[PDB]
């Protein structure tokens, strides 16, 4: 048991597209979205 080191160092290697790459990765896990019934409020 250690309490003297910082264990949140992964973010020192994050880059420009890290957040959106993870969002792309999560895309296969989502439930299908609900539908308002039309393509947009202007349709």
């Amino acid at each position: 048991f250690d309490n003297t080191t910082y264990k949140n160092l992964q973010h020192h290697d994050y880059s420009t597209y890290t957040f959106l790459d993870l969002n792309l990765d999560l895309s296969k896990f989502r439930m299908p979205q609900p539908s308002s019934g039309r393509e947009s409020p202007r349709h």
Binding site: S36, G37, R38, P41, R42
Partner: protein, 87 residues
């Protein structure tokens, strides 16, 4: 947007000729009634006044804005076209 000048009935007369004054170019008139405008509580009062003075007249029915259905919430409709794209 003020509606306070739409409360009362008015009586005006037909518009007649105005011409340019040769000296100054001012608008001249020969119509003694060109500026006459009477005010009445109701159209019955106006009609009564017109009848006893021998003037032929036209009465136009008062136009009142029709009551509208307003809903702020409709600005954010989930599935209707009333949703606003900007605020």
């Amino acid at each position: 947007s003020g509606v306070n000048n739409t409360k009362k009935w008015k009586m005006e007369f037909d518009t007649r000729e105005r011409w340019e004054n040769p000296l100054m170019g001012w608008a001249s008139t020969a119509d003694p009634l060109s500026n006459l405008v009477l005010t009445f509580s109701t159209k019955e009062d106006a009609v009564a006044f017109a009848e006893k003075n021998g003037w032929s007249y036209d009465v136009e029915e008062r136009k009142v804005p029709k009551p509208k259905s307003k809903s702020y919430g409709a600005n954010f409709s989930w599935n209707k076209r009333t949703r606003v794209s900007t605020k």
